[PDB]
Amino acid sequence: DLDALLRRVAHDQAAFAEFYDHTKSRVYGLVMRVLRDTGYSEETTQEIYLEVWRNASEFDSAKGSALAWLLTMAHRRAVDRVRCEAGDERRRVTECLKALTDTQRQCIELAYYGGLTYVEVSRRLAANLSTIKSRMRDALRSLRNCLD
């Protein structure tokens, strides 16, 4: 249904309000996590939903979920910001993140939340590019499996 909501936001609709209402805590929370500044996190979140509105016609549900489309563009924008410059689902995910090995949790922590490129992670962890790429893959596979 979130896909159907996003399908209705391109021209205008009152579903943009509903699309926003259902996703805002996850977008804002991610941005907050990456930027760690209330002011810029608010402004970045606005930019994200402005892009949702404008580029919603580019969305193709047969390429991925509306949720993934939104969070991916939100993450890209927040990470860029760093470089250029209910509770049940929450605890379910936290268990899976905690069930990862230390190295596999560290890869996601530095790359995803810390905004580091896989090259930057390889340099910081004194490892090869092959190793970090395989490790990022392993971390995401374990998460995919645990969350299923």
């Binding site: 943009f16 926003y20 929370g29 390429k63 991925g64 993934a68 489309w69 993450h75 490129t117």
Partner: protein, 73 residues
């Protein structure tokens, strides 16, 4: 096969803007079966992280809703 190694980093936005453009350039040239495998990988990672977002959730201020819905006009 090597190109498939970049899918996960790419999906996490864990490549530089330079390298991202090189990857896009490369899956643009790759044969259809290779490009599909890459995109399936990328997609699967984005979905996983979209699910994972439940862990970092946080409530925005009500004033942001006002400005966001108004920016449509």
């Amino acid at each position: 096969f090597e190109l498939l190694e970049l899918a996960t980093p790419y999906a996490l936005n864990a490549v530089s803007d330079d390298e991202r453009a090189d990857i896009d350039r490369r899956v643009a040239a790759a044969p259809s079966p290779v490009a599909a495998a890459f995109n399936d990988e990328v997609r699967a990672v984005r979905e996983t992280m979209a699910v994972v977002s439940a862990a970092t959730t946080a409530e925005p201020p009500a004033h942001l809703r006002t400005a966001i819905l108004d920016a449509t006009k």
